[PDB]
Amino acid sequence: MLKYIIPTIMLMPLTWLSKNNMIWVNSTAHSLLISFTSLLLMNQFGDNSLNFSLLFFSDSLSTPLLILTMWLLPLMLMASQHHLSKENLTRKKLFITMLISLQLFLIMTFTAMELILFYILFEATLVPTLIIITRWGNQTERLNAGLYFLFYTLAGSLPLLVALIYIQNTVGSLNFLMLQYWVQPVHNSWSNVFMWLACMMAFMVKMPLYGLHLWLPKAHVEAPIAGSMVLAAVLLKLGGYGMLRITLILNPMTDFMAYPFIMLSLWGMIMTSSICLRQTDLKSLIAYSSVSHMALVIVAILIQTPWSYMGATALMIAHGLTSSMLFCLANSNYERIHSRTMILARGLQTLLPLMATWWLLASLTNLALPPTINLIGELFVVMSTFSWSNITIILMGVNMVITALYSLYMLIMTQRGKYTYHINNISPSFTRENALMSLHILPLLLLTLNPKIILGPLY
């Protein structure tokens, strides 16, 4: 993995040693070259994972997350450079440095063999993320959003630290390759119930699980655009990735320990989808949409079937590109009208025709139109939960109806109807904004022609 870690680190001296006005050009160009080289991780075998060394390894689960991670950095740089234009140069460079350091922690997090190494890097992502929100957020509430984000995560992660260290003492290792062979069944006892919870609750807060989700809408409403993109596209997936790995050593106890969390997720997805129909803040609506989508991922991970693990992996990738796109679309309006209220500016298709097409395409993927990878992932999860219990089709079906309703309602309210008379600073879309939207949707729709590369190890 050093062929990715070192060039990622080199983005820092590149940014600091760049000419004053070439910080955005240089960092964007070279982080795209890194993204290009990330496709060499596609050397995935049918039996063995790609095991580079004692420290790092890739398999079909981490590879798509790694490529999404490295593709998102240049996108976050284009998204951020406009609202940071009046910032002084040193503080712009520090902002870019926080993004670079976040990518460094993320690519190491997804490739660590040893679970304590995963834990530390998984935790290290908190620091830059918190700094980005609290330092470069816009409004007063960003200080509270930072505190909720920090302490929700730590309330879960600290018990995980105890459980992992406990596991190593008993088993002798936390290397994931070893755990695949030395794993032993978890027998029923109160000790193992709390070991199960300590192993899972940290990842559940990250997803986030319904009931532990209220931190997410606060963080998104307060974060700058790049903070929202990384939060939605990748940071939520640390919980999914962690659960996908650690469930290996929690069998068969997961058979009954999952029930309360399946009920929360199955019911939670309907409640959060219905909540989206009444949200007034556009960033808050997209944040609730993420909770609804990630509820399927939690269910898929917990029922542990080949089809659901394939569905979970595809949904994680599809949601990352879609939700990041929606935040960018919402931000482009915000950079014009300086308000997140969804009803403030209406009829925008009349004033920004092409940008209205990006809205349409983003909404179609959000409601999972076939054959988008958003549907492939959702369909696979729906198939597997039907076998788990036929009744779930009713909850899944209702959610798909409500999801279409709020996805189009968001499109109809902002893009259709009559334009707001008094708003007269709706300037034409910039090339930067159009390129930003198309760098989300084009890779997303191209993946439809070759879905296997995002279906994970169970493919």
């Binding site: 730590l154 630290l161 105890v162």
Partner: protein, 347 residues
């Protein structure tokens, strides 16, 4: 103070500590504590104001009471073993007195009341000695007598210190009181692991000393003693706010910073001994500390507080304080986690 006398008094403080750490005889250990206390009072009094006089008086009474209890333990030990060797004690009653005497010296709860007041009443440079160098001597004795220490007593002192230190710091705006309650909480972690692995006590002690010395040095560089005074640093020394930010997050135990290492290694040692509830409780309670470190980062670094017009005059003059070892200390305070296995040098 005459600069030559100040050096001599500082060396006497150091010599008193060294005597404690090289003595194999309880009388010489007691002499070391007496010498150390004698020389520390002048540096607490060196600015001659009523608050300094109160701090030195409260310090003298607390340390003198503890040294009397230490001598009482030594004599009880002599009665029941007929020897003076510095090691495990040979009477349970002597062990409780010596443990309580040393807890009083360290300022652990519920003998903690003096630490916030004495630290607040003395200069920053004196507080730096009080909360760092002065922990060495009592900890070095605890390192040698721990086999005879009552497990319930030492863990109770540890848990109370983590709770008291965490809760006490939430209500503080004075930087010296914040550091004092931070100290109480950190002594708790050091003594919790002492019965299981004394090496992790030393690791936590050394790392705590480095970060605490870093914070005190940065407070001295700007002559800040209050939260609001510290909130002006952004409009004078922007670099210092970044260093303060990183050090505070390290003191909060956040990965991947150096201050995570002692909490991490201590959790490991207690779990190896089938102690799960205690490490979990301690880690959660340590979030109280993380909260009021984060509050300081908000007012110092992550937001820009209002300034004053006269600050523009400060822009024209350079920072002339010594700030000795600050570049080294701050780097060790934050970037040592990749070198964690080096803790075996302490074995």
């Amino acid at each position: 103070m005459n600069p030559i006398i100040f050096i001599i008094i500082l060396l006497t403080i150091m010599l008193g500590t060294i005597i404690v750490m090289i003595s194999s005889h309880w009388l010489l250990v007691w002499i070391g504590f007496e010498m150390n206390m004698l020389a520390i009072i002048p540096i607490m009094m060196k600015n001659h104001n009523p608050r300094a006089t109160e701090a030195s008086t409260k310090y003298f009474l607390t340390q003198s009471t503890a040294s009397m209890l230490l001598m009482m333990a030594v004599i009880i030990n002599l009665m029941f073993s007929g020897q003076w060797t510095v090691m495990k004690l040979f009477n349970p009653m002597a062990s409780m007195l010596m443990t309580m005497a040393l807890a009083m010296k360290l300022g652990m709860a519920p003998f903690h009341f003096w630490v916030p007041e004495v630290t607040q009443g003395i200069p920053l440079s004196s507080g730096l000695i009080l909360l760092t160098w002065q922990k060495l001597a009592p900890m070095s004795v605890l390192y040698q007598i721990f086999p005879s220490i009552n497990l319930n007593l030492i863990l109770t002192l540890s848990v109370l210190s983590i709770l008291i230190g965490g809760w006490g710091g939430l209500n503080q705006t004075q930087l010296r009181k914040i550091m004092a309650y931070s100290s109480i909480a950190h002594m708790g972690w050091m003594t919790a692991v002492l019965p299981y692995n004394p090496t992790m006590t030393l690791l936590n002690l050394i790392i705590y000393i480095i970060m605490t010395s870093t914070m005190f040095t940065m407070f001295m560089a700007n002559s800040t003693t209050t939260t609001l005074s510290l909130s002006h640093t952004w409009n004078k020394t922007p670099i210092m706010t970044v260093l303060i930010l990183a050090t505070l997050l390290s003191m909060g135990g956040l990965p991947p910073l150096s201050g995570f290492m002692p909490k991490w290694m201590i959790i490991q040692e207690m779990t190896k001994n089938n102690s799960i509830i205690l490490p979990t409780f301690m880690a959660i309670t340590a979030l109280l500390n993380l909260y009021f470190y984060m509050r300081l980062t908000y007012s110092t670094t992550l937001t820009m507080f209002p300034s004053t017009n006269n600050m523009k005059m400060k822009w024209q003059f350079p920072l002339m304080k010594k700030m000795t070892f600050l570049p080294t200390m701050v780097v060790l305070s934050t970037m040592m986690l990749p070198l964690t296995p080096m803790l075996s040098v302490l074995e």
